[PDB]
DNA sequence: GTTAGGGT
């Protein structure tokens, strides 16, 4: 055992701490406690009854309204704004099965509709079952909720389904996503919402009494949330007979879901696309005859295949199939050659190029923009080239979707994003390298890694359809059929790669007290070893007690729309009065960093984050500094200029700004804040005290701690608390910096690509870790008294300061318990406040002089 | 010296 720096405090300070604690310990309307205790007493049968009675609004129908809409539908179908809207609707394949779907829904609880993109199942099946209910004189009994995997799709589909009815939004169709909602009318309505929204709505209505029909869309995509939703329906549908579910899927293992619901009726509806010709790597080299020059394993795959096509393809071509680098995106100048080939032959249309990540996209842009070949220079000024990446500006602009200048061709160099999320309408030709990136968690080593991998059959199939929007197209797949033969069916259901604490905590509010039993009933059962690893985290932050039952803190954490660690972080900042910077920290780690990453400028972006980080040496405080800057730029009417100067997305920041209010309002409604404003001065008296912020940041990111040991940009010798050597990711503002006032760091995500990096970090002090962490004991090991945290880091500490810090952790642990059970804002001159001021004082001993 | 893609 080694010994860190001395953390003993001056005598005058410990004397004040003991006095303030003596005050705290001279202390002697909680509806929350009665709610918490009820949830723990009742069994499931009793839980079912109570949620019935409490959500009984749909047990009521409106006959004067029933009739009026039935009268109004028949009448408004004869206008000359409709009947043209109906006739164009009836060209869609789904509408040809309208009356059978009506019947299959009447005769069965769960049906499934499988149909390719273009079939109109999603805009039409919701309308088909509403208009039927309205005419049958049943209108006010019908409330249809249809989920989507994505926010953007939920709106434009609802704006469209509202246009197909000659209505403004919020009459008979609505949408509701997080923090933004155009709600429909209460009854006789179609509401489009993201799966997350519906899952939060279950806390109040866990047996779906507040809807008559449920449509799950894009189930084949296997989002955690649709995967989760179908398990829960197995628990709900025995207690909800009047409830009608309609699952919806592409032609991607549709049978998994039909099996899953026991052999339910299944409609197949055909699509509306142009046919897109599939070319593979052999057929590409036959048309371009490109030459490459500057484990195998590769040969096991290619020679048995080359033999089956010895007489069907050229001889010089098939020898390049032996080169390991012909497939994938290994040779950019090859991919460079195929675009130039499309630009000359093969008629007019855009080129959408699918590359794995930021690095490979950046390479080809410069090749197409700054070519080394004469054939490249010939073309460069006749192509308008768009890189398409989440961290790049192009998605939030209008150009890439629209047509190029006259005489120039559009070439889109994209990651996996343009497969589902982004849709460019003038694409004819798709170049599919077949390579993508994926995040992998190894349960055994506690390492998340980011790897390039092959894509699956479902993906290529998705990218082929991307070419059939305007006219018949072509898809060039830069891998042979022998690769496709060995590719996976679908991607790993992401629930199998994900941490599970947040679901486990949520499941406790649906009176599903056993996560091992429940998660096994999903289509793909999660690793029970990852289920246990979930509970332990939750037990550690004390959202579950040692028996594993929900605790009063844990109910608050389950009622916040954020992972419990940062949920717990936010709650501390209410009790310690630093609300605004902390909820900036939380929204950022949950959602994402508002900074773009434009091509070439990465060096300049470092300088911007360095200036925004204000030498506070923390990525989380850096974003808050950005958010305070963004607010000032609104106050100056310089917002646009501000965002163009610092590579910032105003869309993100306003959404980051919205999450903070959602955080503040919840905390206020929960009785932890006196004001729902995240900016209010009382909620923020300590928002200027940096050593306090680092201590509340650490309370949430603990126990992901790092220790740094070397100085030289600067070279770093740093290891996480488990012994593995790490670095700051080059994107984090702590990369390369020297002269840290402290050698201890907390981080949210660590990840391996070319090294094991901490993607974000805040510099923290040993005293603050000791007070908010665990694994604390006082002792002697050398001939020195020590103080440790996580039983991992041992700090020189005299006895007088230890017995105060331990006594301080006792009182802190007593305060947090009572606040979870009996939430109220901390009064300014009460007993509770003295213990707070005792911690504020001990943490300011670490202030930068 | 570097960042697949969703969402409450």
* C-alpha angle A507-A509-A511 in degrees, rounded to nearest 5: 75
Is there a contact between A227 and A524 (Cβ–Cβ < 8 Å)? Answer: yes
CA of A223 to C1' of B6 (A): 8
Nucleotide nearest to A199 (CA to C1'): B8
Strands A143-148 and A213-216: parallel
A390/B2 CA-to-C1' distance in Å: 15
Residue A80 CA distance to nucleotide B7 C1' (Å): 41
CB atoms within 10 A of CB A31: 10
Question: Nearest nucleotide (C1') to the CA of residue A438?
Answer: B4
Distance of A731 CA from B3 C1′ (whole Å):
7
Residues A395 and A392: their CA atoms lie apart, in Å, by: 7
Nucleotide nearest to A223 (CA to C1'): B6
Give the closest nucleotide to A415 (alpha carbon vs C1').
Answer: B4
Dist. CA A816–CA A451, nearest whole Å: 41
CA of A680 to C1' of B2 (A): 38
Chain centre distance of CA A520: 23
Q: A148 CA to B5 C1', in Å?
A: 15
Q: What is the CA radius of gyration of chain A?
A: 30
**How would you classify the pairing of strands A266-269 and A110-115?**
parallel
A450 and A589 share one domain = no
Cα separation, A768 vs A840, in Å, equals 10
Q: What phi and psi values does residue A323 have, to the nearest 5 degrees?
A: -65, 125
Residues in chain A: 849
d(CA A149, CA A128): 22
Cα(A415)–Cα(A438) distance, integer angstroms: 12
Residues 6+ positions from A580 with CB-CB distance below 8 Å: A624, A660, A678, A679, A683, A684, A687
The Cα–Cα gap between A490 and A550 comes to 36
Measured distance CA(A713)–CA(A717) in Å, rounded: 14
Breaks, C-N > 2.5 A, in chain A lie after: 28, 294, 712
Q: For chain A, first and last CA: distance in Å?
A: 31
Distances in Å between the Cα of A608 and the Cα atoms of A396, A631, A648, A713, A757 are 21, 17, 10, 16, 21
A323 CA from B7 C1′ (Å): 41
Protein CA at A712 to nucleotide C1' at B2, angstroms? 21
CA distances from residue A832 to A16, A346, A575, A684, A829 in whole angstroms, order as listed = 16, 75, 10, 17, 8
Q: Which nucleotide is nearest to A417 (CA to C1')?
A: B5
Report whether the peptide linkage leading into residue A703 is cis, meaning its omega lies within 30 degrees of zero: yes
Q: Are strands A409-414 and A350-354 parallel, antiparallel or unpaired?
A: parallel
Q: Domain containing A528: what range? A: 492-550
- Protein residue nearest nucleotide B4, by CA to C1': A437
Q: Which residues pair with A708 in a beta bridge?
A: A718
Regarding whether A5 and A40 lie in a shared domain, the answer is no
CA angle at residue A768 from A744 to A501, to 5 degrees? 80
How many domains does one find in chain A?
Answer: 4
- Asked if A510 and A610 sit in the same domain, the reply is no
**Unique residue bearing structure tokens 């230890």:** A802
- Provide the 3-class DSSP secondary structure of residue A145: strand
B5 C1' closest Cα residue: A417
> Cα(A548)–Cα(A514) distance, rounded to whole angstroms?
9
- Angle, vertex CA A88, rays to CA A85 and CA A91, nearest 5: 150
What is the C-alpha to C-alpha distance for residues A580 and A559, in angstroms, rounded to an integer? 20
Q: At which residue do the structure tokens 């309002």 appear? A: A665
| Nucleotide showing the shortest C1' distance to residue A562 CA | B8
Do A542 and A640 lie in one domain? The reply is no
Instruction: For A760-798, give one letter per residue: b (16+ CB within 10 A) or e.
Output: bbbbbbbbbbbbbbeebebeeeeeebbbbbeebbbbbbb
Last residue of a domain, one of A272, A289, A315: A272
Do A433 and A481 lie in one domain? The reply is yes
Give residue for tokens 């799950």: A216
Residues A256 and A288 in one domain: no
Q: Identify whether residues A587 and A572 lie together within a single domain.
A: yes
CB A412 within 8 A of CB A424: yes
Select from A272, A307, A331 the last residue of a domain.
A272
Closest protein residue to B6 (Cα–C1'):
A150
Q: In this structure, are A732 and A837 located in the same domain?
A: yes
CA separation for the pair A538, A505 (Å, rounded) = 8
Question: Are A631 and A532 in the same domain?
Answer: no
Q: Which nucleotides of chain B have an atom under 7 angstroms from any protein CB?
A: 1-8
Q: How far apart are CA A108 and CA A241, in angstroms?
A: 10
Technique used: X-ray
Q: Which helix (H) or strand (E) holds A530?
A: helix A528-540
Is A646:A612 a contact under the CB 8 Å cutoff?
yes
A473 DSSP β-pair partners: A276
* Domain final position from A272, A303, A324: A272
Residue A323: both structure tokens together: 């080169």
**Residue closest to A458 by CA, chosen among A271, A785, A745, A221:** A221
CA distance A236 to A208: 8
- What the block records as the tokens of A371 is 């070519």
**A754 CA: nearest nucleotide by C1':** B2
Residue nearest to nucleotide B7 (CA to C1'): A196
Backbone angles phi, psi at A607, to 5 degrees: -60, -35
Residue from A413, A317, A311 nearest A364 by CA? A413
Shared-domain flag, residues A636 and A662? yes
Q: How many CB atoms lie within 10 A of CB A41?
A: 7
- What residue spans of A764-830 are helical by DSSP H? 766-772, 799-821
Shared-domain flag, residues A560 and A577? yes
Instruction: Indicate if A138 and A52 belong to the same structural domain.
Output: yes
**Residue with CA nearest to B3's C1' atom:** A358
Q: Kindly give the interhelix angle for A579-590 and A619-635, rounded to the nearest 10 degrees.
A: 110
In angstroms, the Cα distances linking A549 to A45, A131, A507, A555 are 19, 47, 12, 11
Q: How far is CA A641 from CA A592, A638, A649, A653, A655, in A?
A: 22, 5, 12, 15, 19
Q: List, in order, residues 6 or more apart from A112 with CB less than 8 Å away.
A: A246, A247, A248, A249, A254, A257, A258, A261, A264, A265, A266, A267
Residue with tokens 């070519």: A371
Distance A795 CA to B5 C1' (A): 43
Q: Measure, in angstroms, how far nucleotide B5 C1' is from residue A84 CA.
A: 39
């Amino acid at each position: 055992i080694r010994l860190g720096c001395n953390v003993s405090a001056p005598s005058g300070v410990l004397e004040r701490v003991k006095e303030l604690m003596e005050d705290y310990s001279r202390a002697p309307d909680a509806k929350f406690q009665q709610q918490f205790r009820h949830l723990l007493s009742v069994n499931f049968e009793e839980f079912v009854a109570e949620t019935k009675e409490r959500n009984a609004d749909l047990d009521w129908v409106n006959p004067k309204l029933d009739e009026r809409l039935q009268l109004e539908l028949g009448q408004r179908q004869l206008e000359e704004n409709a009947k043209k809207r109906l006739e164009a609707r009836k060209k869609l394949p789904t509408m040809k099965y309208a009356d059978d779907i009506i019947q299959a829904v009447r005769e069965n609880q769960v049906i499934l509709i499988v149909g390719s993109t273009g079939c109109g199942k999603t805009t039409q099946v919701p309308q088909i079952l509403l208009d039927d209910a309205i005419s049958r004189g049943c209108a006010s009994s019908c409330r249809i909720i249809c989920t989507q995997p994505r926010r953007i799709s939920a709106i434009a589909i609802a704006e469209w389904v509202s246009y197909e009815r000659c209505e403004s939004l919020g009459n008979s169709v609505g949408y509701q996503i997080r923090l933004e909602s155009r709600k429909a009318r209460e009854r006789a309505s179609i509401t489009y919402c993201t799966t997350g929204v519906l899952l939060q709505q279950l806390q109040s209505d866990p047996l779906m009494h507040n809807l008559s029909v449920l449509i799950l869309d894009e189930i084949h995509e296997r989002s955690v949330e649709t995967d989760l939703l179908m398990g829960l329906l197995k628990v709900i549908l025995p207690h909800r007979p009047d409830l009608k579910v309609i699952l919806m899927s592409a032609t991607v293992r549709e049978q998994d879901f039909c099996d899953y619901f026991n052999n339910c009726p299944m409609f197949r509806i055909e699509g509306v696309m142009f046919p897109v010709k599939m070319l593979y790597l052999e057929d590409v080299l036959s048309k371009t005859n490109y030459e490459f020059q500057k484990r195998m394993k590769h040969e096991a795959m290619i020679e048995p295949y080359l033999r089956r096509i010895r007489n069907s393809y050229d001889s010089r071509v098939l020898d390049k199939l032996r080169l390991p680098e012909s497939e994938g995106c290994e040779d950019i100048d090859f991919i460079a050659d195929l675009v130039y080939y499309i630009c000359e032959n093969e008629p007019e249309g855009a080129i959408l190029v699918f590359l794995p990540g930021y690095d490979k996209i950046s390479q080809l842009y410069n090749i197409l923009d700054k070519p080394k070949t004469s054939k490249g220079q010939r073309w460069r000024d006749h192509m308008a080239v768009f890189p398409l990446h989440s961290l790049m500006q192009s998605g939030e602009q209008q150009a890439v979707f629209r047509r190029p200048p006259a005489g120039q061709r559009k070439v889109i160099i994209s990651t996996i994003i343009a497969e589902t999320s982004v849709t460019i309408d003038d694409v004819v030709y798709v170049i599919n390298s077949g390579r993508t990136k994926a995040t992998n968690y190894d349960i055994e080593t506690n390492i998340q890694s980011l790897d390039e991998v092959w894509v699956t059959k479902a993906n290529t199939q998705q990218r082929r359809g991307r070419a059939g929007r305007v006219r018949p197209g072509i898809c060039y797949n830069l891998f042979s059929r022998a690769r496709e033969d060995r590719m996976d069916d679908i991607p790993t259901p992401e629930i199998l790669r994900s941490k599970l604490e947040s679901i486990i905590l949520s499941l406790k509010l649906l009176h599903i007290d056993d996560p091992y039993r429940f998660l096994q009933t999903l289509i793909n059962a999660p690793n029970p070893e990852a289920i246990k690893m979930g509970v332990e985290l939750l037990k550690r932050i004390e959202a579950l007690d040692q028996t594993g039952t929900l605790t009063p803190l844990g109910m608050h954490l389950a009622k916040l729309p954020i992972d419990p660690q940062m949920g717990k972080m936010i709650l501390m900042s209410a009790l310690f009065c630093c609300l605004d910077p902390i909820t900036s920290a939380a929204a950022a780690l949950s959602f994402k960093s508002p900074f773009y990453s434009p091509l070439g400028k990465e060096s300049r972006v470092d300088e911007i984050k360095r200036r925004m980080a204000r030498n506070m040496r923390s990525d989380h405080l850096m974003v808050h500094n950005t958010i305070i800057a963004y607010r000032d730029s609104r106050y100056s009417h310089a917002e646009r200029d501000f965002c163009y100067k610092n590579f910032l997305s105003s869309m993100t920041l306003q959404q980051l700004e919205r999450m903070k209010n959602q955080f503040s309002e919840l905390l206020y409604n929960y009785k932890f804040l006196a004001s729902s404003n995240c900016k209010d001065a009382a909620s923020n008296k300590n928002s200027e005290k940096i050593p306090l912020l680092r201590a509340i940041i650490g309370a949430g990111l603990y126990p992901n701690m790092a220790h740094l040991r070397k100085s030289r940009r600067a070279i770093h010798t740093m290891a996480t608390d488990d012994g593995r050597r790490v670095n700051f990711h080059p994107s984090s503002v702590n990369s390369g910096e020297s002269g840290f006032d402290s050698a201890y760091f907390v981080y949210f995500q660590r990840q391996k690509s070319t090294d094991l990096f901490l993607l974000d970090s805040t510099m923290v002090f040993p005293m603050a870790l000791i007070i908010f962490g665990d694994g604390v004991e006082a002792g002697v090991t050398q001939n020195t008294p020590y103080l440790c945290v996580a039983k991992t880091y041992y700090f020189k500490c005299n006895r007088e300061t230890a017995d105060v810090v331990i006594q301080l952790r006792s009182n802190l642990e007593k305060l947090l318990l009572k606040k979870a059970l009996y939430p109220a804002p901390i009064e300014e001159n009460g007993y509770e406040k003295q213990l707070i001021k005792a911690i504020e004082l001990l943490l300011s001993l670490d202030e930068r002089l």
